[PDB]
Amino acid sequence: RMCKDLKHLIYYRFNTGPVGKGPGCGFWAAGWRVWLFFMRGITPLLER
RNA sequence: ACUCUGGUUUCUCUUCAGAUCGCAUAAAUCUUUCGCACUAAAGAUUUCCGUGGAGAGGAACAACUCUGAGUCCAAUUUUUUGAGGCCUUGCUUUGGCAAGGCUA
Ligand SMILES: O=P(O)(O)O[C@H]1[C@H](OP(=O)(O)O)[C@@H](OP(=O)(O)O)[C@H](OP(=O)(O)O)[C@@H](OP(=O)(O)O)[C@H]1OP(=O)(O)O
């Protein structure tokens, strides 16, 4: 849900101006952060 | 204005760290609370991601910038003079002292 949140955060700043709707936005650092912080927590679970 | 420290980088270990150890943020478990728990909150513990400090060990090139330490004044106002000489008493430790008056 959080990554979708960040998509809504990023796209609606990305798709302003002459940029319209479309699949061209990639500012991937926010979601990539979120999934790495998930990997931080489940690394010792899957390791155990 | 002459001389002796201390370096910096990197790899690793050990210990302390409730300090935004992290200008970022996970997960598990337990307990509590209400719902009726991914869509929910509290408290606590733990594990992870991965820090600062100190100590130690290796190995790479810099070695005295830095942090330190050991290492030109005679004219009013101070350090280039108002300084020296005479008289009375108390005692003379008979050398003279103390006070006052002087004279320059
Ligand atoms: O917000 P979501 O439910 O996750 O859906 C979004 C949304 O589509 P909808 O508006 O129809 O809901 C975006 O559109 P806008 O928010 O801009 O209006 C669209 O982005 P673009 O239209 O700008 O391309 C995006 O597509 P994507 O994330 O693939 O870029 C799409 O996500 P979905 O792929 O899940 O439909």
The per-residue DSSP string of A2-26 comes to HHHHHHHHHHHHHT-TT--SSTT--
Q: Chain centroid to CA A24: how far?
A: 14
- Are A21 and A7 within 8 A, CB to CB? no
From A29, A28, A25, select the one nearest A14 (Cα to Cα). A25
Calpha distance A39→A34 (Å, rounded)? 9
Calpha distance A10→A32 (Å, rounded)? 13
* Distance of CA A8 from the midpoint of ligand 1 (Å): 8
Q: Which one-letter DSSP state was computed for residue A48? A: -
3-state SS assignment for residue A1: coil
- The pick from A4, A6, A7, A9 for probing ligand 1's pocket by mutation, whose C-beta has the most ligand atoms within 8 angstroms, reads A7
Task: Retrieve residue A36's tokens.
Answer: 């790495």
- Are A34 and A3 within 8 A, CB to CB? yes
Note the resolution in Å, 1 decimal: 3.3
- Nearest CA, atom 23, ligand 1: A21
Looking up tokens 């936005």, which residue turns up? A25
Residues in chain A: 48
